[PDB]
C-alpha cells in the first residue's frame, strides 16, 4: 500500500496551526489571576496528528495537546499531558453551533475544553468543570492571538 | 544540585520503564505476513516533560513509517498508559498493570474488534524484546510480531 492521507476532518482543526500568544484568565483562583503563554500548534505525522505545545514561562510549565480524528469512533481525540504530571484524554464530536468542545472525565469531575474561532488571527479556549450533576463552572479563558 | 522547585517529580513507577531508554537497533519479525517478513528499524526512547512521559520513536524506513509511543504512569488508575500513533493513521490506547512474572504487558482494544497485547521482557542491560499478540473473542493470544531491540546509545 501507500501512506493513507490524513483525514479530511483535520480541516476542523486548521485554525489552531501556527504560533499564538495566549492571554489567559484563571477563574479557579479567587480573585481571578491573569497571565500569558505561548500556544504553538504544528501538523505532525503527515497531518494525522496536530500537536500543540503550551509553554507558560510563568509557572515553568510545558504541556502538549495531541489531537487526532478517530474514524471508528466518529470523534476527535485530544490527549493532554505536561511536566507537572497533569494528564487528560478528551473527545469531541466536532464543531457544533459555533463551538468545538472536548470533554472527558478527570481526577484532580467532568472537564470541558471549548474552542471558539474569533477571526483569522484569534481563537479562544474556555475551560469548564462540572461536579455530580450540577452546572458548568468556568475554570479558565485563554485568548490566542496569532504571531505566525 | 538538590535545588528542586514546586513542580512534582516524575512518579517513581517510571523506573519500571527505564530499560526502554536510549537508541536501539530493532530487528523485527512479522508473523501476520505469509510468509513471515523481517526487517530492521530504529526504536529510540527519550525521557520527556521532566520524566513524566517516555516517548518512543519507531522509525521503519523500509515501510516509510514513523510512529510514536507515549507512556505514563496514571496513579488514579494504578496503571501505565501507552498512547501509540503513527503517520499511517494507526492509533491505539494501551494500559499495563506493570511488571508481572518477568513480563510487562500493555493491552488494549483494536488499532486505527480484537484485543491487542504488546509484551516487553528484558534480556540484558542492552537488549529487550517486544512480542505483539492479538486475541479474537475469548480465545488465546496469537503471536503477531516479535522485535529484538539492541541498544546502540
Alpha helices (H) along chain B = none
The CATH number of the domain holding residue B29 is 2.40.128.20
Residues paired with residue B84 on neighbouring β-strands, in sequence order: B69, B92
**Position B5 in a domain:** no
CA distance B110 to B93: 9
Contact B104, B1 (CB under 8 A): no
Dist CA B95 CA B54 (whole Å): 14
Resolution in A: 2.1
Return the closest-CA partner of residue B56 out of B89, B22, B28: B22
Nearest CB neighbour to A45, from listed B49, B70, B85: B85
Residue B6, domain member (yes or no): no
Residues from chain A contacting residue B116 (CB–CB below 8 Å) = none
In a domain, B96, yes or no: yes
Task: Please tell me the distance from the alpha carbon of residue B131 to that of residue B39, in angstroms, as a whole number.
Answer: 15
Q: Is B110 helix (H, G, I), strand (E, B) or coil?
A: coil
Closest CA to A60 of B1, B53, B4, B2: B4
> What is the rounded distance in angstroms from the CA atom of residue A62 to the CA atom of residue B67?
22
Asked if residue A16 belongs to a domain, the reply is yes
Chain B positions touching A3 (Cβ under 8 A) are 64-65, 87-88
In a domain? residue B1: no
Would residue A1 count as lying in a domain? Answer: no
Q: How far is CA B133 from CA A125, B30, B83, in A?
A: 41, 11, 17
The nearest CA of chain A is from the CA of B123 a distance in Å of 30
Q: CA nearest B104: which of B42, B45, B17?
A: B17
Closest CA to A138 of A35, A30, A11, A26: A26
Residue in chain B closest to A73 (alpha carbons) equals B112
Site of grid cell 499564538 = A20
Instruction: Cell numbers for B109, please give them.
Output: 482494544
- B80 to each of B16, B35, B83, how far by Cα in Å? 10, 34, 10
Instruction: Give the C-alpha separation, A84 to B52, whole Å.
Output: 8
Strand partners, B103: B100
Q: Which residues of A touch B (CB under 8 A)?
A: 3-4, 6-7, 45-46, 48-49, 60-62, 64, 66, 68, 70, 72, 77, 79, 81-85, 87, 89, 107
Q: How far lies A102's CA from each of A107, A109, A129, A135, B33, in Å?
A: 16, 14, 12, 17, 38
Query: CA nearest A82 in B: which residue?
Result: B49
Whether A92 contacts A104, CB under 8 Å: no
Which of B9, B27, B121 lies closest to B75, judged by CA?
B9
Residue A2 covered by a domain: no
Instruction: Tell me the backbone φ, ψ of residue A137, rounded to 5 degrees.
Output: -105, 120
> How many domains in chain A?
1
Q: Please give the Cα distance from A101 to A128 (Å, whole number).
A: 10
| B126–chain A nearest CA distance, Å | 28
Other beta carbons less than 10 A from residue B67's beta carbon: 19
Nearest alpha carbon to residue B91 among A78, A112, A101, A54: A78
Experimental method: X-ray
Q: Which residues of B touch A7 (CB under 8 A)?
A: 89
If you measure CA to CA, which chain A residue comes closest to B109?
A72
Please give the radius of gyration of chain B, using alpha carbons only, rounded to the nearest integer. 16
Residue given cell 479530511 in the structure block: A8
CA A121 to chain centre: 16
- CA B52 – CA B68 distance, rounded (Å): 16
Q: How many helices (H) and strands (E) does chain B have?
A: 0, 11
Closest CA to B147 of B132, B135, B137, B136: B132
Q: Which three cell numbers stand for residue A61?
A: 510549565
Residue B30 sits in which domain range? 12-151
CA B69 to chain centre: 6
| Residue B112 with chain A: CB contacts under 8 Å | 70, 72
* Residues 6+ positions from B95 with CB-CB distance below 8 Å: B77, B79, B80, B81, B82, B106, B107, B108
Amino acid at each position: 500500500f501507500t501512506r493513507p492521507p490524513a483525514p479530511e476532518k483535520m480541516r476542523d482543526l486548521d485554525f489552531l496551526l501556527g504560533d499564538f500568544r495566549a492571554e489567559w484568565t484563571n477563574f479557579t483562583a479567587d480573585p481571578a489571576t491573569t497571565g500569558t503563554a505561548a500556544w504553538n500548534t504544528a501538523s505532525t505525522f503527515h497531518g494525522h496528528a496536530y500537536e500543540m505545545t503550551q509553554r507558560v514561562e510563568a509557572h515553568d510549565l510545558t504541556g502538549r495537546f495531541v489531537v487526532q480524528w478517530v474514524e471508528s469512533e466518529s470523534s476527535f481525540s485530544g490527549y493532554y499531558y505536561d511536566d507537572w504530571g497533569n494528564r487528560t484524554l478528551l473527545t469531541s464530536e466536532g464543531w457544533q453551533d459555533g463551538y468545538l468542545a472536548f470533554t472527558g472525565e478527570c481526577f484532580g469531575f467532568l472537564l470541558k475544553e471549548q474552542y471558539e474561532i474569533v477571526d483569522e488571527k484569534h481563537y479562544v479556549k474556555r475551560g469548564f468543570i462540572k461536579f455530580d450533576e450540577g452546572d458548568w463552572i468556568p475554570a479558565d479563558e485563554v485568548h490566542c492571538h496569532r504571531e505566525a
